[PDB]
Amino acid sequence: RTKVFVWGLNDKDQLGGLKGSKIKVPSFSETLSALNVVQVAGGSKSLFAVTVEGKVYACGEATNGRLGLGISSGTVPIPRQITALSSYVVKKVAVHSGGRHATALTVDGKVFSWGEGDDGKLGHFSRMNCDKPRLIEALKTKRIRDIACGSSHSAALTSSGELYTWGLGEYGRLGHGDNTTQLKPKMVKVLLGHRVIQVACGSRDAQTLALTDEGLVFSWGDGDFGKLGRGGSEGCNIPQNIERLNGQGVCQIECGAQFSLALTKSGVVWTWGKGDYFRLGHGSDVHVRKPQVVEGLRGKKIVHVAVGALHCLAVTDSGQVYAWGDNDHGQQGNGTTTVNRKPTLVQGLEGQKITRVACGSSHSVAWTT
Amino acid sequence: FDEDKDEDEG
C-alpha cells in the first residue's frame, strides 16, 4: 500500500477528488492511495499516476488533450485510466509543471507521447495534437531508459547513454548547434562520449539539463536569469559543462519555471536561475546565476526533490517534507497562502514516512512506500 | 504578474 497526499491548486480538480480550490494542508487522497502508485507526476493543472501494475491514471484539466484520455476540452475530476496504454506496463510518465504534453516510457523501452503538438514536441514528424498516446516510431530501434518533457520540447536517453531531443528549437534548447525546430528525435552528437543518465527540460524560453554517469552536469538553451548556471544571461545551443557542480555527486536534476535544481548523493540541494517569488529557496527573491547550495537544508540528507513552477519540495531520509517558494494557491502546505522564503517543514505529514514528492504547476504531492 | 503563475479559475 502507498499513501498519497496532495495539496495546492485544485480549480480543475487536478488533486483527484478533493473539495475546495486552495488546499493549503496536505490531504490524504483516497483515489490515488488505492491505486498503489510507483510515480506521480504533475503538469499544468494536471496529475498523472503510474501504478505498480503498470497502468497510468490522469486527472485535472483536459484542454489540449494533455491527459491523453481521448478528450480535449473539459476536466476529469477523478483519476481515470489511460486505456490506450492498457496493453503495456508503463514505468514512468514525463511532464513539465507548466506542460500540456507528456510522454510515457514502458519497461521494455517504448515511448508514447500525447497532448499539445506545437513545435513537434510529440515527435511524430509533425505539429499535430494527440488526444491519445501514440508510439514515437523514431525511437523504436532504441532501448530508452529515461524521458523528460519541457513545455515546448522533449527528451529521451538510451541505455547506452545517447540523448535525443526534439521540439521547439528557439533559443537553442535542443542542443544541436542551431535554433531549428526538430519534429523528430535527433541525437545530441556533442554529448557523444558521455553516458547521459538524466535529462531535464524547462518551460517558456527554456533551458535543458543533462547528467552523466561521471557526475558531470551540462546545460544549454535559454540563458535568462542565469538558469544555465554559468553566470550572466547568455544562451547557447550546444551543451556546456556546469563546472561548479563538478565533483559534487549530482544524482538528480530538475527544471522549474526559469530555474534549475540539482540534488547530490550526499543530500545537498543546489538551485539557480530566476529568483522572483522565492522559488530558489535562498531567503531572497534575487536571481542566482551560478548554482548555490540551499543553506536552509544543510545537515538534512535530502533523498528526493520535486519542482513546480514557483515552488519546490524536498524529502529527508527520515520522511520529512520541506517546501519553499510561492503560495498563491496553498502549494507550500503551511496552512496559509504565505510564501516560504526558506525551506519550511510541511504540515500534516507527521507519522507518514514520505519517500517521494511530485509537483504540478501549482500543486504538490507526497507519497510513501 | 508572473507568466508562469496559475490563475484560480474557481
From Swiss-Prot, chain A:
Subcellular location as annotated: Cytoplasm; Cytoplasm, Cytoskeleton, Microtubule organizing center, Centrosome, Centriole; Nucleus
Protein modification: Sumoylated with SUMO1 by PIAS4 in response to double-strand breaks (DSBs), promoting the interaction with RNF8.
Start-end of each RCC1 repeat: 1-52, 53-107, 108-159, 161-211, 214-265, 267-317, 318-369
UniProt comment concerning the protein's domains: The ZZ-type zinc finger mediates binding to SUMO1, and at low level SUMO2.
Disease / disorder: Intellectual developmental disorder, autosomal recessive 38: A disorder characterized by significantly below average general intellectual functioning associated with impairments in adaptive behavior and manifested during the developmental period. MRT38 is characterized by global developmental delay affecting motor, speech, adaptive, and social development. Patients manifest autistic features, aggression, self-injury, impulsivity, and distractibility.
Its biological purpose: E3 ubiquitin-protein ligase that regulates ubiquitin-dependent retention of repair proteins on damaged chromosomes. Recruited to sites of DNA damage in response to ionizing radiation (IR) and facilitates the assembly of UBE2N and RNF8 promoting DNA damage-induced formation of 'Lys-63'-linked ubiquitin chains. Acts as a mediator of binding specificity between UBE2N and RNF8. Involved in the maintenance of RNF168 levels. E3 ubiquitin-protein ligase that promotes the ubiquitination and proteasomal degradation of XPA which influences the circadian oscillation of DNA excision repair activity.
Subunit and interaction comment: Interacts with XPA. Interacts with NEURL4. Via its interaction with NEURL4, may indirectly interact with CCP110 and CEP97.
Protein name (Swiss-Prot/TrEMBL): E3 ubiquitin-protein ligase HERC2
Organism (species): Homo sapiens (Human)
Gene, per the UniProt record: HERC2
Segment of the intact protein contained: 2958 to 3326 of 4834
From Swiss-Prot, chain B:
Induction (UniProt): By FOXM1 transcription factor.
Tissue: Expressed in testis, pancreas and skeletal muscle.
Processing and modification events after translation: Ubiquitinated by CHIP/STUB1 in an HSP90-dependent manner; leading to proteasomal degradation. This ubiquitination can be reversed through auto-deubiquitinating activity.
Transmembrane segments: none
Annotated signal peptide: none
Location(s), subcellular: Cytoplasm; Mitochondrion
Quaternary structure, from the entry: Homodimer (via C-terminal region). Interacts with HSP90AA1.
Known function: Deubiquitinase that plays a role in different processes including cell cycle regulation, mitophagy or endoplasmic reticulum stress. Inhibits TNFalpha-induced NF-kappa-B activation through stabilizing TNIP2 protein via deubiquitination. Plays an essential role during mitosis by deubiquitinating and thereby regulating the levels of Aurora B/AURKB protein. In addition, regulates the protein levels of other key component of the chromosomal passenger complex (CPC) such as survivin/BIRC5 or Borealin/CDCA8 by enhancing their stability.
Family stated for the protein in its record: Belongs to the peptidase C19 family.
Name by which UniProt lists this protein: Ubiquitin carboxyl-terminal hydrolase 35
Native species: Homo sapiens (Human)
Lineage: Eukaryota, Metazoa, Chordata, Craniata, Vertebrata
Gene: USP35
Range within the parent protein: 989 to 998 of 1018
